C-alpha cells in the first residue's frame, strides 16, 4: 500500500525506497571506508549508517520503517542519504581530520574590543 502523495511539493513517491536506501547506505559505507580510522567523522558516520541499515533490514514495510527511524518520511530518508553521500565524497577531497590550518590571532575572538591589556 503506497501513499497517494508525500505532502511536499516537488517530491515524488518512491516506488522502491528500501533498495534505494540500502544502496545509498552501502555507497556511503564504501565512501567512508577509504578514510583513516582515527577520524571521528568516519566512526560516527559508520555507526549511524549501520544502525539505519539495520532499521531498513529489520522492517520490510514502509510505514513501520518511517516509525522506526523517526526522521521524516522515507523520501526524506533518501534525500538525507544522497546528501550524506555528497558530503562524504567531499570529505575524501577536503580531508578535515588534520590539525588547524590557521590558529586564532591575538585579541580576535574576545568581544569587548577596546579594553586595554
Amino acid at each position: 500500500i503506497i501513499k497517494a502523495s508525500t505532502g511536499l511539493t516537488g517530491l515524488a513517491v518512491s516506488t522502491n525506497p528500501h533498495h534505494t536506501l540500502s544502496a545509498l547506505y552501502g555507497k556511503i559505507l564504501r565512501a567512508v571506508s577509504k578514510m583513516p580510522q582515527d577520524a571521528s567523522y568516519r566512526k560516527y558516520t559508520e555507526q549511524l549508517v549501520k544502525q539505519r541499515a539495520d532499521s531498513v533490514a529489520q522492517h520490510k514495510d514502509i510505514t513501520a520503517l518511517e516509525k522506526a527511524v523517526g526522521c521524516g518520511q522515507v523520501e526524506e530518508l533518501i534525500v538525507q542519504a544522497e546528501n550524506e553521500l555528497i558530503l562524504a565524497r567531499k570529505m575524501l577531497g577536503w580531508k578535515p581530520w588534520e590539525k588547524l590550518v590557521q590558529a586564532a590571532p591575538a585579541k580576535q575572538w574576545d568581544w569587548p574590543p577596546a579594553q586595554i591589556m
Binding site: 567531499k90 586564532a104 590571532p105
Partner: protein, 208 residues
C-alpha cells in the same frame, strides 16, 4: 523565586553542548572554538579557509540538517587585525535548532562563497560586499545591491561617516540630479553616553 529573571532552557543547553563537542570532534581542521552563549545559542568560530566545508557539513549530515540559512551578517570591528567578521546563522528544521558560524576576514583577503551550499548566499554575500567590501570569491555575480550606482565606498564600516561624504541636489542648469560635497544645515550632535562606572563585574576579565 525570581520572576524578573529569564530562566534558561536546559534541554536547549545539553543538546547544544553535546552537539558543539560533536562538531568540534568531527571538524578539527577548521573549527577553532565552540561556545554556548547566554540565551542558549551555539557559536562555532571557524577558520576563513573553512567557510564552505563547515556550512556544507551542517547542511548534509544526518546528525545536523542545518538546511536553512536565514542570514549572513558582517560586523566591522576595526580594533582587531582581521577587522571584519562574517556570521552565518543556520536553522535546522529537522532537529528544530539554530547554529551560528563565525569567521574573520580582512577587506583584501577574499572569502569562500557559500552559494554552492545555500542559494540565499547568492544575495546576502552581495550585501556585505556592498556594505563592508568583503570580497566573496567564486560568486555568480558580485554586484552593488543596496547603495547608489555612483556610490564610492562601503558605508557600514566604523571608519565611514554617518552622514556620508556627498549629497545630491537637482541642478536646473545641467537639468539633472548632481552630486555635491556634504554640508548639513544642522550637524549631528554627538552625545557622550559613556558610563564612567562599570556595571558588569562578570565581564571584567572576559578578554583573555
Amino acid at each position: 523565586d525570581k520572576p524578573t529573571v529569564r530562566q534558561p532552557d536546559a534541554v536547549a543547553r545539553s543538546h547544544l553542548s553535546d552537539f558543539g563537542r560533536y562538531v568540534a570532534e568531527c571538524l578539527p581542521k577548521y573549527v577553532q572554538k565552540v561556545q554556548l552563549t547566554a540565551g542558549d545559542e551555539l557559536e562555532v568560530l571557524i577558520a576563513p579557509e573553512g567557510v564552505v566545508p563547515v556550512l556544507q557539513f551542517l547542511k548534509d549530515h544526518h546528525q545536523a540538517q542545518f538546511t536553512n540559512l536565514v542570514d549572513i551578517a558582517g560586523v566591522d570591528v576595526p580594533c582587531r587585525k582581521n577587522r571584519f567578521e562574517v556570521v552565518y546563522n543556520l536553522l535546522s528544521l529537522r532537529y528544530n535548532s539554530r547554529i551560528r558560524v563565525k569567521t574573520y576576514t580582512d577587506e583584501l583577503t577574499p572569502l569562500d562563497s557559500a552559494c554552492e551550499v545555500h542559494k540565499a548566499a547568492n544575495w546576502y554575500e552581495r550585501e556585505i560586499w556592498d556594505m563592508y567590501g568583503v570580497f566573496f570569491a567564486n560568486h555568480p555575480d558580485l554586484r552593488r545591491i543596496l547603495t547608489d550606482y555612483g556610490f564610492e565606498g562601503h558605508p557600514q564600516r566604523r571608519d565611514f561617516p554617518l552622514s556620508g561624504y556627498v549629497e545630491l541636489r537637482y541642478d536646473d542648469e545641467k537639468k539633472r540630479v548632481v552630486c555635491e560635497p556634504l554640508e548639513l544645515a544642522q550637524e549631528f550632535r554627538k552625545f557622550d553616553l559613556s558610563a564612567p562606572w562599570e556595571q558588569f563585574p562578570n565581564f571584567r576579565n572576559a578578554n583573555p
